[PDB]
């Protein structure tokens, strides 16, 4: 099993994303959204080739979209380490 | 998809005056003008802003294993 | 709130359109702002700031636009309110 | 009877003020607010001494408050002519 760890601030991002979705749409949608994020985390932990190279932001940083959000993470020896999960409006794609 | 916001009395009256003068059609038009200015303020520095958010993530402590069950339990526990 | 009194909090429901809505959402979810309201207030402060230095010109322009709007006519309160009722069903 | 006339734009101001109040507060309050503005108009048409001198905006302009609004008007031979009714947030008081 590939490893999957989150920085504390990434977990707090997930809480805010959950709360935002919950306020608007209710429990079922918010839980679904986190489930989609979770499924994506598992896929990224398994497949190095999916990760988008985000060196132009910080060397070794990777990004991947899910829904209206972006997972920003780094590869580790055994999986990934998620640094932030941000809304796509915060993105800066490579020039 | 609308949002319900509390502008506080000072800015609420500011919005009302602009609509009642006929300068703007609705409260929404006023709010959108404000948000355009806020978006404009930061539009030129999105890379620095993202770098700051990433750095704040990196500096937020040691990463811990992701535990979806614990997360959802915590969400349920807040305001069950 | 003390008994026999009421909340006087006053909100507004606004349509920001999708582009600015997503802009607000991202700012709240990043933790940069605590609520949608805080983001909207920052925007309104910038809008108030942009025009704060030209209030005299702005008022002159509104007065001039009144002066130029046509000849003045008699006012009747009851006719006005009848006209308001005629625009559609009214309640409260 | 002292004369009371309104510029077309002042009538349109009153419609917007009425509609704004109606959305927020409903019929009884919005109609009352207009009635209070009407009572103020009648008082100003009768008493020249109430008018606040707003020459610093335009020569001959007068102002007077009612509720959260300001009536901007001119004196005529026989009464007043209302030019605009604006929210007090639009004011530029004399320095």
Numbering used by the authors:
A (entry chain A), D (entry chain C): 4 to 98
B (entry chain D): 4 to 83
C (entry chain B): -5 to 86
Show sentences the authors wrote.
Overall with the crystal structure of the PrpTA complex, it was certain that the PrpTA biological assembly unit indicated with PrpT:PrpA2:PrpT contains two PrpT monomers, which were isolated from each other, and a PrpA homodimer. In other words, PrpT:PrpA2:PrpT heterotetramer is maintained by one single PrpAFL homodimer interface formed by N-terminal PrpARHH domains and two PrpT-PrpAFL heterodimer interfaces, which is similar to its structurally relevant complex, such as CvParDE, and consistent with the conclusion that PrpA dimer interface and PrpT-PrpA heterodimer interface with an estimated CSS (Complex Formation Significance Score, calculated by PISA server) value of 1 contribute to PrpTA heterotetramer complexation. PrpAFL begins with an extended conformation (β1) spanning from 5 to 9 aa, followed by the α 1 helix (11–23 aa) and the α 2 helix (30–45 aa). The C-terminal PrpT neutralizing domain (49–85 aa), which is also the tetramerization domain, is connected with the C-terminus of the α 2 helix by a hinge region composed of AGS triad [Figure 2B (upper)]. That is, the PrpT binding could result in the dramatic flexibility-to-stability transition of PrpACTD, which provokes the de-tetramerization of PrpAFL antitoxin and the rotation of PrpACTD by ∼80° around the AGS residue triad, further leading to the extra interaction between toxin PrpT and RHH domains of PrpA homodimer. PrpA and PrpT interact via two hydrophobic subdomains surrounded by electrostatic interactions.
Recently, PrpTA was found to be a pMBL6842-encoded type II TAS with the unique function to regulate the plasmid replication in Pseudoalteromonas rubra. In addition, PrpA could also competitively bind to the iteron sequences in the ori, interfering with the binding of replication initiator RepB to the ori site, thus preventing the overreplication of the plasmid.
